[PDB]
Enzyme design. Structure first.
Site, PDB file in Angstrom:
ATOM      1  N   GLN B  15      39.745  18.788  61.100  1.00 44.69           N
ATOM      2  CA  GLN B  15      40.712  18.533  62.161  1.00 44.69           C
ATOM      3  C   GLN B  15      40.715  17.071  62.591  1.00 44.69           C
ATOM      4  O   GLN B  15      41.770  16.539  62.952  1.00 44.69           O
ATOM      5  CB  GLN B  15      40.431  19.445  63.352  1.00 44.69           C
ATOM      6  CG  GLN B  15      40.692  20.913  63.061  1.00 44.69           C
ATOM      7  CD  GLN B  15      40.695  21.764  64.310  1.00 44.69           C
ATOM      8  OE1 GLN B  15      39.680  22.357  64.673  1.00 44.69           O
ATOM      9  NE2 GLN B  15      41.841  21.830  64.979  1.00 44.69           N
ATOM     10  N   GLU B  63      34.547  27.999  55.597  1.00 45.56           N
ATOM     11  CA  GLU B  63      35.440  29.091  55.960  1.00 45.56           C
ATOM     12  C   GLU B  63      36.855  28.712  55.543  1.00 45.56           C
ATOM     13  O   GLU B  63      37.230  27.534  55.630  1.00 45.56           O
ATOM     14  CB  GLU B  63      35.399  29.397  57.464  1.00 45.56           C
ATOM     15  CG  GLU B  63      35.439  28.173  58.361  1.00 45.56           C
ATOM     16  CD  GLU B  63      35.222  28.511  59.822  1.00 45.56           C
ATOM     17  OE1 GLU B  63      35.169  29.714  60.157  1.00 45.56           O
ATOM     18  OE2 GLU B  63      35.107  27.568  60.636  1.00 45.56           O
ATOM     19  N   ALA B  91      28.625  29.381  57.882  1.00 44.49           N
ATOM     20  CA  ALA B  91      27.242  29.367  58.343  1.00 44.49           C
ATOM     21  C   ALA B  91      27.057  30.095  59.665  1.00 44.49           C
ATOM     22  O   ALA B  91      25.937  30.527  59.959  1.00 44.49           O
ATOM     23  CB  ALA B  91      26.744  27.927  58.477  1.00 44.49           C
ATOM     24  N   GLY B 135      28.194  22.974  65.489  1.00 44.94           N
ATOM     25  CA  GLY B 135      28.194  24.043  64.512  1.00 44.94           C
ATOM     26  C   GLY B 135      27.133  23.889  63.436  1.00 44.94           C
ATOM     27  O   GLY B 135      26.405  22.902  63.379  1.00 44.94           O
ATOM     28  N   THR B 171      30.194  25.049  74.017  1.00 45.50           N
ATOM     29  CA  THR B 171      30.865  26.257  73.563  1.00 45.50           C
ATOM     30  C   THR B 171      29.920  27.298  72.978  1.00 45.50           C
ATOM     31  O   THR B 171      30.371  28.405  72.666  1.00 45.50           O
ATOM     32  CB  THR B 171      31.926  25.908  72.515  1.00 45.50           C
ATOM     33  OG1 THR B 171      32.655  27.089  72.162  1.00 45.50           O
ATOM     34  CG2 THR B 171      31.269  25.338  71.269  1.00 45.50           C
ATOM     35  N   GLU B 246      28.809  -5.946  57.483  1.00 41.64           N
ATOM     36  CA  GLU B 246      28.587  -7.008  58.460  1.00 41.64           C
ATOM     37  C   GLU B 246      27.926  -6.476  59.727  1.00 41.64           C
ATOM     38  O   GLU B 246      26.780  -6.823  60.028  1.00 41.64           O
ATOM     39  CB  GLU B 246      29.914  -7.691  58.786  1.00 41.64           C
ATOM     40  CG  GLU B 246      29.797  -8.977  59.577  1.00 41.64           C
ATOM     41  CD  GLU B 246      29.811 -10.204  58.692  1.00 41.64           C
ATOM     42  OE1 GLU B 246      29.904 -10.049  57.457  1.00 41.64           O
ATOM     43  OE2 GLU B 246      29.758 -11.325  59.235  1.00 41.64           O
TER      44      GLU B 246
HETATM   45  N1  LIG Z   1      35.525  15.863  69.789  1.00 42.30           N
HETATM   46  C1  LIG Z   1      35.877  16.936  69.089  1.00 42.30           C
HETATM   47  N2  LIG Z   1      34.945  17.913  68.814  1.00 42.30           N
HETATM   48  C2  LIG Z   1      35.299  19.008  68.099  1.00 42.30           C
HETATM   49  C3  LIG Z   1      36.600  19.154  67.640  1.00 42.30           C
HETATM   50  N3  LIG Z   1      36.678  20.318  66.961  1.00 42.30           N
HETATM   51  C4  LIG Z   1      35.465  20.908  66.984  1.00 42.30           C
HETATM   52  N4  LIG Z   1      34.602  20.117  67.693  1.00 42.30           N
HETATM   53  C5  LIG Z   1      33.174  20.393  67.929  1.00 42.30           C
HETATM   54  O1  LIG Z   1      32.741  21.402  67.038  1.00 42.30           O
HETATM   55  C6  LIG Z   1      31.823  22.257  67.682  1.00 42.30           C
HETATM   56  C7  LIG Z   1      31.895  23.660  67.096  1.00 42.30           C
HETATM   57  O2  LIG Z   1      31.914  23.625  65.686  1.00 42.30           O
HETATM   58  P1  LIG Z   1      33.249  24.029  64.883  1.00 42.30           P
HETATM   59  O3  LIG Z   1      34.466  23.417  65.528  1.00 42.30           O
HETATM   60  O4  LIG Z   1      33.386  25.529  64.852  1.00 42.30           O
HETATM   61  O5  LIG Z   1      33.053  23.429  63.402  1.00 42.30           O
HETATM   62  P2  LIG Z   1      31.596  23.351  62.727  1.00 42.30           P
HETATM   63  O6  LIG Z   1      30.767  22.291  63.408  1.00 42.30           O
HETATM   64  O7  LIG Z   1      31.722  23.027  61.261  1.00 42.30           O
HETATM   65  O8  LIG Z   1      30.958  24.818  62.925  1.00 42.30           O
HETATM   66  P3  LIG Z   1      31.362  26.096  62.030  1.00 42.30           P
HETATM   67  O9  LIG Z   1      32.776  26.535  62.309  1.00 42.30           O
HETATM   68  O10 LIG Z   1      30.422  27.235  62.336  1.00 42.30           O
HETATM   69  O11 LIG Z   1      31.247  25.734  60.574  1.00 42.30           O
HETATM   70  C8  LIG Z   1      32.192  22.224  69.154  1.00 42.30           C
HETATM   71  O12 LIG Z   1      31.032  22.220  69.950  1.00 42.30           O
HETATM   72  C9  LIG Z   1      32.937  20.920  69.336  1.00 42.30           C
HETATM   73  O13 LIG Z   1      32.129  20.023  70.056  1.00 42.30           O
HETATM   74  C10 LIG Z   1      37.543  18.177  67.913  1.00 42.30           C
HETATM   75  O14 LIG Z   1      38.696  18.305  67.510  1.00 42.30           O
HETATM   76  N5  LIG Z   1      37.177  17.065  68.642  1.00 42.30           N
HETATM   77 MG   LIG Z   2      32.636  27.794  60.660  1.00 41.81          MG
END
Ligand SMILES: Nc1nc2c(ncn2[C@@H]2O[C@H](COP(=O)(O)OP(=O)(O)OP(=O)(O)O)[C@@H](O)[C@H]2O)c(=O)[nH]1
Ligand SMILES: [Mg+2]
Ligand SMILES: Nc1nc2c(ncn2[C@@H]2O[C@H](COP(=O)(O)OP(=O)(O)OP(=O)(O)O)[C@@H](O)[C@H]2O)c(=O)[nH]1
Ligand SMILES: Nc1nc2c(ncn2[C@@H]2O[C@H](COP(=O)(O)OP(=O)(O)O)[C@@H](O)[C@H]2O)c(=O)[nH]1
Ligand SMILES: [Mg+2]
Lengths: 51, 431, 58, 426, 42, 430
Positions: B15, B63, B91, B135, B171, B246
């Site tokens: 994303q 996923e 995971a 995550g 979260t 740098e």
């Molecule tokens: N700043 C920011 N943090 C994000 C964003 N999307 C997800 N996160 C962070 O991602 C964490 C949760 O993990 P996921 O979004 O589910 O993705 P992941 O880290 O690969 O974890 P899994 O889905 O289990 O694989 C949250 O605590 C957020 O802090 C985003 O668009 N911007």
């Molecule tokens: Mg996931």
């Protein structure tokens, strides 16, 4: 090379960019307004579905 | 010549990457098809015979619901189909599962694709890996990812962007367990790891951008401007330029301290850019404001080591050196005594672009910041106590123990984090 | 939500006035073809730092 | 009959030399296509000092440009006069030093200098009686300061009985445009004290002061500052290629300026520079040149001569001008000002007069003055290097690249020698 | 003859300043931007 | 080069902020949308689009007053980040605005005035407008003084104050607001001024022929006074005066910084048709207690210092003629220890009258700031009122509960008791 050597030329090309940016941000304001109108008609839509 | 590979890992990686790649096509005149409607694209894109560019990105995830809208979106045809790497089952917020059980099935597939992009390059400048500490895929699978690249690739630059968990808003529940175990791997197997917190971006987007109801669209649009600031010295000429190699050497005082803090300025709305004059001296005062920081740590408690500055647009070297003189005179801003020449200046020419449907304005001149403060001791001491509070009674440890790793990795990772905090006490103290 | 990154097609408004490219074609050519190499023999004229070939008489 | 091979070291070397080749090709009436468009036959009488012949009645400069980033190199040719160079003279690496002096002196530069010295030996062989070389660089970076010292030691041992000019931009104390900036300068002056015939000290802080106070430029980018720097490089060595009533070429000043072999650091300044508003309100005479040549406003370094003693003085003039009035004003400033001049060296000032002025101007004057006040540039740099090195900051990016921990103590003790050796002449 | 030559040189300097200002006005009036300097969507 | 940052606090402050800035627009010809169709640089700022944002910050603790400014005619001229509004007001309480509520927004404005002062390459002095009656204009304004002294050391801080009226008071706890701020504005104030509403009511009923005025017809009158003070900072004259000058030649002691505001002429457009307006006829009108702008009479007191602000078609010929005639009369006294008590400032530009106001086409004007020993008349009346209420524990339970201890009333009353002895030993002859 004359343009590089001059300086009032650099002043003028500094000013014309700002004169451009004014119109660009005005059209951005118009874009934001039309997005707001779209959100408004979305809200009216969902109110009709609720009814 | 200058070339770099982006490895977006996890849902937070994909994303973020979609926000990055929508803006890079705007910067280089690329249609969503990938063809043009001048070798600036060579840093991220590979040129084929048909006048098509292919990004040097690898989208890896465990996923399928995160990656399929990339496969069927508007940008479905820019990306090569084999860049988008999908696992079979996620995971599920486990550092152990991404490191021990699930991540070991597709890691061999990733490293071949990592190999197939570096042999094309005539010379590599760095890597970019984007991940989140919340995550499991962004923590566990990213952990053994670095150790394979560290052995395979000797001293290539591997920059990191981290989503550190917000101090009070989170979260998940096993989220503090993930952050402790991943600092053991980002200490000895990373070149530079950037720091941004979520909760700071929500506060900035509310107060400054005048957005009452933000979403991850507006947050990732702000993050993509920071990398666009860093990469603008790679892609477009400047009065003086700063490469990835740098500021890698000129920011870190010690190999154990490679966690800078980011700040973007100005962050203003399109209705207020009509009002405010935007100059060089005005924007650099907004970089030092503790309100406008992108990390929820207060630098007034700490002392600055060095500052990396990146100015873009209509900027002259005299106004930068005049405004640096103003900052150093004041008493409210401190620097460590063994680093008087603290600053570093980067100047570029091409102004930042505006995305369609975005939330910023057309800015003639902006500024970034990559500063290093001793205020990041407070962000770890609160996470140290939260992880200690959960681990005291041994909650949520049976999930990690029963999946491949034994009990004592938490005990050795806590002592590594307890030793890492004492490095900040000894470096920061005046002598 | 993922469509929002690319819902809107590009508009010529949403682009800067200045575009300064980085063209490296000749530097790429000089990297491709190396920076000279000496296999010639030493062929230099003999010279004296005050005069070259005087005319001495008487 | 006396030729100089040109060297530009690093990025800051490349922008300085690019403007320098424009200001003297205009002085010699040479277009960037390469041919000759001149109105005087005297211009082509001495052009072999800096040029070489090409087929078709063309002249090309005797320069080679060393660099460690090709983006800096291609920006030079896209500008004003980039098509005059032979492409073989350009030489550049693949990975930059990253503002690391040790990386540019042991790790990165040690492979490029084999290719650079292939071309330097070619340009030095085409001359008939080589007067010397010349180098331009800056002591604030890695490519210009790191490999720039190693290329000096490669050619000084090879060519001992020559002259060797270096232009050093000593890093300014207040701008702080680099974090490792004291580390780069202290290890480089170590190589400029034992290995170099001639070295100038121009400070970017003072270049900002002249453009802000005297020239009154609203936005003076680095293009206008390289008009300031290259106007001194022409005026110093104008005696090699233009005849004068009283001439003094480069080796005449090199013998006379240095009393002792370690003391070859000077401070230039230029005199006729004025603002466009105030140009029409002031005449041009011989006292008008020397009243502004010795002002602390027009010094091109961050040192004040009032705090110290002038050791030896030079002044090279230009234009059709009377040298009773030159020697009249020169004795006058020595007799009024009886403290800032040394007592054991009478008749301090050396003097030359050149007939040919810079174009568009009546008269001109250049200054090369060695004073005791050079040591404040040297002592205050040594204090910031001691602040870094006492708590051992940033050394892991230099120690781990093949360089020991006692090398800095060799350089700091040698740097402490020069700040006290300059003190006992005060 | 010397004083007449000085007057001639002053007039020549005045003419040169007027010519350079006129060229500044002309180069302001006509500005040409390369298509490569133009952004490809623009 | 000269620049002046305005600060306005209170519901009076916003209403006096708008009327002062309305004539500031017509004096420089700036449209409500912020663009013209270098005098203004002390009040407006510069932008690359040629837009001029005023160098003022409105602060208030209620939303009912700022919101009308946000939807008014000048909605796009004022910066939206410069009008700092609160959520809950102090409601006529000094203590609520000082100890509990006012501490919430002291941090935001002190950051906000920093951004304007960082734009200031040279700052002449801050202006602050406040009303003693309200809690916002008394409580938070007291900490507005105290933190400003530490934050900026010796910058000029002039205040236009609104003292409680002698007889017709809008509030009942207004005397407690008056006493507890004068102690704050002793050691944390450079120069002050006082205007009472009846002293403006008496002018408009008698001199302007308006039978039924409003705060509009009052707040335009103080706007004519504030314009002439900063007039010479904006337009040159035969000899000018800055914010620093007329401050220095008026305060003979640091404890005495309370002059009196006065303006002349103030006449209707029908009475401008008849009466001639010379230099002498306007300086004689600044001496009358009928045309004075405070309900106190200098005839009971002595003038220690004077200042005059001439404006328009005025020459030093007629300036020196009228001053001589003033000193001959016996109904005006000067202290024996200030024989050369005058300062004269002369300006070229006539004052600009708003269309729809009350005055008319005027060519000559004067604004006098004479420091008198007749201010001690006013304090003896109000210290009686504070004593008469505090004698038996009246309205004090409101102030105690917020966090201030009860003893601060006796501190601000015995400080007021010593100031009467400070002002009387000045008035004794040698
Ligand atoms: N700043 C920011 N943090 C994000 C964003 N999307 C997800 N996160 C962070 O991602 C964490 C949760 O993990 P996921 O979004 O589910 O993705 P992941 O880290 O690969 O974890 P899994 O889905 O289990 O694989 C949250 O605590 C957020 O802090 C985003 O668009 N911007
Ligand atoms: Mg996931
Ligand atoms: N001279 C003058 N005084 C005014 C004017 N408007 C209000 N006041 C004064 O304001 C006082 C009442 O306080 P307000 O200004 O209404 O409100 P406030 O100052 O913000 O105080 P709070 O309501 O508690 O927040 C009265 O005692 C008046 O003296 C005006 O137009 N002219
Ligand atoms: N006089 C002058 N100095 C410059 C210019 N550009 C950069 N510098 C100085 O050079 C230093 C950095 O050197 P750098 O460009 O990195 O040299 P490099 O390592 O060889 O590329 C800075 O401290 C600047 O003060 C210029 O155009 N003129
Ligand atoms: Mg109120």
């Amino acid at each position: 090379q004359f343009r590089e050597r001059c300086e009032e030329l650099r002043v003028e090309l500094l000013s014309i960019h700002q004169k451009k940016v004014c119109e660009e941000r005005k059209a951005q304001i118009a874009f934001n307004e039309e997005l707001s109108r779209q959100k408004l008609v979305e809200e009216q839509m969902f109110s009709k579905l609720w009814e | 010549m200058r070339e770099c590979i982006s490895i977006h890992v996890g849902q937070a990686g994909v994303q973020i990457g979609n926000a990055c790649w929508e803006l890079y096509c705007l910067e280089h005149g690329i249609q969503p098809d990938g063809q043009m409607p001048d070798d600036s694209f060579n840093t991220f894109f590979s040129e084929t015979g048909a006048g098509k560019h292919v990004p040097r990105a690898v989208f890896v995830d465990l996923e399928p619901t995160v990656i399929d809208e990339v496969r069927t979106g508007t940008y479905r045809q820019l990306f090569h189909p084999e860049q988008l790497i999908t696992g079979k089952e996620d995971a599920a917020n486990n550092y152990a599962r991404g490191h021990y059980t699930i991540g070991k099935e597709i890691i061999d597939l990733v490293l071949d694709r990592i190999r197939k992009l570096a042999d094309q390059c005539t010379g590599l400048q760095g890597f970019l890996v984007f991940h989140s500490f919340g995550g499991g895929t962004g923590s566990g699978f990213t952990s053994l990812l670095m150790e394979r690249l560290s052995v395979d690739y000797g001293k290539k630059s591997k920059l990191e962007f981290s989503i550190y968990p917000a101090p009070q808003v989170s979260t998940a529940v096993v989220e503090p367990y993930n952050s402790i175990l991943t600092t053991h791997t980002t200490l000895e197997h990373s070149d530079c790891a950037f720091m941004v917190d979520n909760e700071a971006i929500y506060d900035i987007c509310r107060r400054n951008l005048d957005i009452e109801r933000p979403t991850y669209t507006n947050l990732n649009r702000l993050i993509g401007q920071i990398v666009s600031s860093i990469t603008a010295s790679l892609r477009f000429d400047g009065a003086l330029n700063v490469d990835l190699t740098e500021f890698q050497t000129n920011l870190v005082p010690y190999p154990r301290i490679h966690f800078p803090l980011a700040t973007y300025a100005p962050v203003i709305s399109a209705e207020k850019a009509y009002h405010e004059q935007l100059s060089v001296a005005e924007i650099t005062n907004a970089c030092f404001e503790p309100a406008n920081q992108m990390v929820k740590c207060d630098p007034r408690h700490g002392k600055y080591m060095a500052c990396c500055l990146l100015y873009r647009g209509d900027v002259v070297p005299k106004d930068v050196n005049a405004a640096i003189a103003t900052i150093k005179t004041k008493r409210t801003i401190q620097f460590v005594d063994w680093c008087p020449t603290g600053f570093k200046v980067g100047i570029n020419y091409q102004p930042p672009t505006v995305v369609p449907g975005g939330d910023l304005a057309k800015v003639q001149r902006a500024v970034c910041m990559l500063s290093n403060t001793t205020a990041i001791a407070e962000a770890w001491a609160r996470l140290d106590h939260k992880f200690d509070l959960m681990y005291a009674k041994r909650a949520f440890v049976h999930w990690y123990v029963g999946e491949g790793m034994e009990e004592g990795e938490f005990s050795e990772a806590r002592e590594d984090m307890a030793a890492l905090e004492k490095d900040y006490e000894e470096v920061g103290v005046d002598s | 939500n993922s469509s929002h990154y690319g819902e809107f097609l590009p508009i010529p408004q949403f682009f800067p006035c200045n575009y300064t490219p980085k063209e490296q074609v000749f530097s790429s050519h000089i990297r491709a073809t190396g920076f000279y190499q000496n296999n010639t023999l030493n062929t230099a004229p003999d010279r004296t730092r005050t005069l070259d070939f005087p005319n001495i008489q008487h | 009959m006396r030729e100089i091979v040109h060297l530009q070291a690093g990025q800051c070397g490349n922008q300085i030399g690019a403007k320098f080749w424009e200001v003297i090709s205009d002085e010699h009436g040479i277009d960037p296509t390469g041919t000759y468009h001149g109105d005087s036959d005297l211009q082509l009488e001495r052009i072999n000092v800096y040029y070489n012949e090409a087929t078709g009645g063309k002249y090309v400069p005797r320069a080679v440009l060393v660099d460690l980033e090709p983006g800096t190199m291609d920006s030079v040719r896209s500008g004003p006069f980039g098509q005059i160079f032979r492409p073989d003279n350009f030489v550049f690496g693949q990975s930059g030093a990253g503002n690391n002096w040790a990386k540019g002196h042991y790790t990165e530069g040690a492979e490029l200098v084999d290719s650079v010295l292939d071309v330097v030996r070619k340009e030095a062989e085409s001359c008939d009686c080589l007067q010397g070389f010349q180098l331009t660089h800056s002591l604030g970076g890695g490519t210009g300061s790191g490999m720039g010292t190693l290329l000096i030691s490669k050619i000084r041992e090879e060519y001992p009985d020559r002259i060797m000019n270096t232009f050093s931009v000593v890093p300014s104390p207040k701008v702080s445009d680099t974090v490792v900036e004291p580390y780069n300068a202290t290890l480089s002056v170590h190589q400029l004290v034992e290995n170099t015939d001639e070295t100038y000290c121009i400070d970017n802080e003072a270049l900002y002061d002249i453009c802000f106070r005297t020239l009154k430029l609203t936005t003076p980018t680095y293009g206008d500052l390289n008009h300031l720097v290259s106007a001194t490089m022409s005026g110093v060595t104008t005696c090699l290629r233009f005849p004068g009533q009283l001439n003094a070429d480069l080796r005449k000043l090199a013998v006379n300026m240095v009393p002792f072999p370690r003391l070859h650091f000077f401070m230039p300044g230029f005199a006729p520079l004025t603002s466009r508003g105030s140009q029409q309100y002031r005449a041009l005479t011989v006292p008008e040149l020397t009243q502004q040549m010795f002002d602390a406003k027009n010094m091109m370094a961050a040192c004040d001569p009032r705090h110290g003693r002038y050791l030896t003085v030079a002044a090279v003039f230009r234009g059709r001008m009377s040298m009773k009035e030159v020697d009249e004003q020169m004795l006058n400033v020595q007799n009024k000002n009886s403290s800032y001049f040394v007592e054991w060296i009478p008749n301090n000032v050396k003097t030359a007069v050149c007939d040919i002025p810079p174009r568009g101007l009546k008269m001109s004057a250049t200054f090369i003055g060695n004073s005791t006040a050079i040591q404040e540039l040297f002592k205050r740099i040594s204090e910031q290097f001691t602040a870094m090195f006492r708590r051992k900051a940033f050394l892991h990016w230099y120690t781990g690249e093949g360089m020991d921990e006692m090398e800095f103590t060799e350089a700091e003790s040698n740097m402490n020698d020069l700040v006290s050796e300059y003190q006992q002449y005060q | 003859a010397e004083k007449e030559e000085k007057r001639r040189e002053f007039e020549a300097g005045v003419a040169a300043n007027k010519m350079c200002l006129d060229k500044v006005q002309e180069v302001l009036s006509t500005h040409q931007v390369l298509p490569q300097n133009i952004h490809p969507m623009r």
